[PDB]
Write a sequence for this structure.
């Protein structure tokens, strides 16, 4: 029993983190096979970052200007290219610790672990979600750019995120590992405001299932609802619309608990309308939305 | 910016987890040097667990009854002893992945990372605290016993916890790595009830500092208090008494923010008396008490 916000074990990814220095800027790179991936803003002076022309800035850079250090050993750079907003530094040595890996582009609502690094050294690991506004709510200080987000399927690491930007509101923007930003954000120090941070309805319901499975049941009630009725209340409270696809995805948790998805919807409706009344659910005073249905089944069944 | 519940990177500990089977019971062991550490209840039948005599049960066990598997390779057991509530299985091979390590016994209020494992395989990592009642609030299913709690100081892993027991109330009890239970708990299926789960006052204050550092400031007020006055309000709300030692420990966060510890005490007093009024602090609707002052400085300065 018990239910915790849980990160993937980080060893496989720890084995891929290096330090990248270009001029006076140090941040993190990802070493997979003979390629090191890093944010292209490594080539910027703080000055450049106001309106950088990356193709023009890159012309002034040679392979020998990209200092790549794995622990205390230097790596030899034999090539460099820009793909979107990442640099790919080709090195003469394949990472001997390369795990099986994929590059995946996740959807909003999907969760992943972040290994926060500084100067290519891991500081900690925590669980995130891609927000509906395509931001993430991270912990990232100067030097943490190039930290990555990942899922693990048994022995295969799926890299979904590389950290690039803090918005003036203290939320975070980055890319997939092809260097394409999640959402409308750019690697430029400009006016960029996040949209509405809506709540991931399907994740909340999954977490309500996790609560029942673990003994927290006070919020169960005698009511049901419809998708359309529920969605009226979702709209008013800035929750994502619930689709039949979301209902279908919650089917296994429905099966295990014997609580129909739409009955659990009626519980969530009352919680939105009435509040918690100073009570808690799995040690939280608000409705948690950074557990996917997949996360809940994984943790409640003990997958490794 | 940003502040997240953050676990230590888990690679160093992943490299120490093995599977231990005695009869029909499988759980996790910790392989450091040529010793595998595991809960002595591995030798129990579910039946034994009502009133086990461990010395008598152990007589019926030989080295060859302890099946120890590191990934897919079996380890040869050449010795076994009981120390308190752990078994030490001597193996003929030193773990080549042994990190620098210590065994430490932590105090209530101190935090640590747990690497949840099943059949010697890591499933995830999360941050905990030793509760004032000497329980922890974990996520532990059947097969997770022998999972360990740790801190990392740069390159040295300090092992503080091994998972042994779930109480009927869904909270968790275990040992240090000398096999001594935290608190009054025993490895017996009996009536064991946790005491008052009081709030770790010094941790809450540390987290309030983390909030100010990261821009969440609405709860700052025009008031101050005294240790004695604050402690009257702490008592009523089941908070640990605040000592001068705790004030001294918060000094650096005091220095950095320029908010006197006793002013921050007056903020915490008003929050206890008035509630959150539907507002949040670092994305939480309750006062977080599983960040130590040390955790807050570490994360806010980016130590690796
Ligand atoms: C995220 C990361 O590690 N970095 C990106 C930000 C870099 N610093 C700056 O360019 C900067 C900070 C503040 C004002 C102006 C410029 C450090 C590396
Ligand atoms: C924690 C862990 O991995 N284990 C301890 C509990 C073991 N199961 C039992 O002895 C048991 C469970 C339920 C009823 C009776 C006995 C599995 C291993």
């Amino acid at each position: 029993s018990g239910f915790r916000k849980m990160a993937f074990p980080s060893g496989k990814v720890e084995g891929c983190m290096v330090q990248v220095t270009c001029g006076t800027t140090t941040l993190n790179g990802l070493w997979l096979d003979d390629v090191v991936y890093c944010p292209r803003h490594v080539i910027c002076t703080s000055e450049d970052m106001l309106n950088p022309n990356y193709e023009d800035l890159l012309i002034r850079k040679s392979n020998h200007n990209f200092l790549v250090q794995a622990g205390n050993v230097q790596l030899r750079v034999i090539g460099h290219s820009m793909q979107n907003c990442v640099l790919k530094l080709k090195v003469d040595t394949a990472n001997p610790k390369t795990p099986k890996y994929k590059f995946v582009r996740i959807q909003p609502g999907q969760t992943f672990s972040v290994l926060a690094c500084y100067n290519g050294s891991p500081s900690g690991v925590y669980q995130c979600a891609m927000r509906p506004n395509f931001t993430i709510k991270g912990s990232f200080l100067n030097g943490s750019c190039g930290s990555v987000g990942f899922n693990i399927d048994y022995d295969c690491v799926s890299f979904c995120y590389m950290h690039h930007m803090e918005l003036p509101t203290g939320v975070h923007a980055g890319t997939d590992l092809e260097g394409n930003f999640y959402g409308p954000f750019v690697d430029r120090q400009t006016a960029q405001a996040a949209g509405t941070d809506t709540t991931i309805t399907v994740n909340v319901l999954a977490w309500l299932y996790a609560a029942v499975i673990n003994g927290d049941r006070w919020f169960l009630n005698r009511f049901t609802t419809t998708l359309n009725d529920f969605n009226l209340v979702a709209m008013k409270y800035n929750y994502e619309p619930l689709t039949q696809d979301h209902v279908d995805i919650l089917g296994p948790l429905s099966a295990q608990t014997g609580i129909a998805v739409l009955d659990m919807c009626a519980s969530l409706k009352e919680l939105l309308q009435n509040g918690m009344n100073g009570r808690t659910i799995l040690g939280s005073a608000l409705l948690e939305d950074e557990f996917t249905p997949f996360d809940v089944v994984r943790q409640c069944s003990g997958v490794t």
Summary: Chain A touches chain B through 54 residues (CB under 8 Å).
